[PDB]
Amino acid sequence: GTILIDLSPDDKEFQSVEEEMQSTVREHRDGGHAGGIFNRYNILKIQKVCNKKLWERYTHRRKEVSEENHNHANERMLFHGSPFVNAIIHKGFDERHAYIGGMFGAGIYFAENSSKSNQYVYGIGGGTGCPVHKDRSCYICHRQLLFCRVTLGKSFLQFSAAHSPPGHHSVTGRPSVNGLALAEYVIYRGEQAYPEYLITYQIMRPE
């Protein structure tokens, strides 16, 4: 059911999406170990993901959440990185494929910092890096992230160094030590996120 619509670099949508990618890069405490050393990306392609069934299941869940939260879905646009992006855009997010550990357990993770989601493209801690060079800082190989519409509803606040807690619809991971880090978010039900944009990019070696 999925079609991918290529956006042109002068489309206003391409530009606002690229600006959110670029402007949310930060430095990471691993000094670039997991995601590579970079201050900006080379954006190669932004595609709009169109799937009617996945959209209808997103908006249906969104209305349920909203009606339980004084008419407030608390919808955000957030990045998601994982090795399974190409499965996700065809079949939707699935909590059954969620990995057992991590800071917030077996959920589907999103991030406000595109650089945080970039650390997961090749797996946890960056896995072995790119398939071709095994370089977690590869400046050559094309990477992909999703920029996703996510329904958070009443989110449980976790001050920070499976299912949502009872009475909540997601978890907000709130950075409590690092001054520059933005929030991460976790949902436990695949239907509460729609992957709107597939972004293809390279990290760039700083001059």
Ligand SMILES: O=C(Nc1cccc2cccnc12)c1ccc(N2C(=O)[C@@H]3[C@H](C2=O)[C@@H]2C=C[C@H]3C2)cc1
């Ligand atoms: O929906 C996901 N994957 C998939 C959806 C639909 C079909 C799939 C088929 C095969 C594999 N994954 C699929 C998915 C769920 C959770 C994660 N996920 C996270 O969000 C966190 C963890 C994870 O597995 C660790 C990797 C990224 C962070 C850290 C990744 C992908």
Ligand SMILES: [Zn+2]
């Ligand atoms: Zn490579």
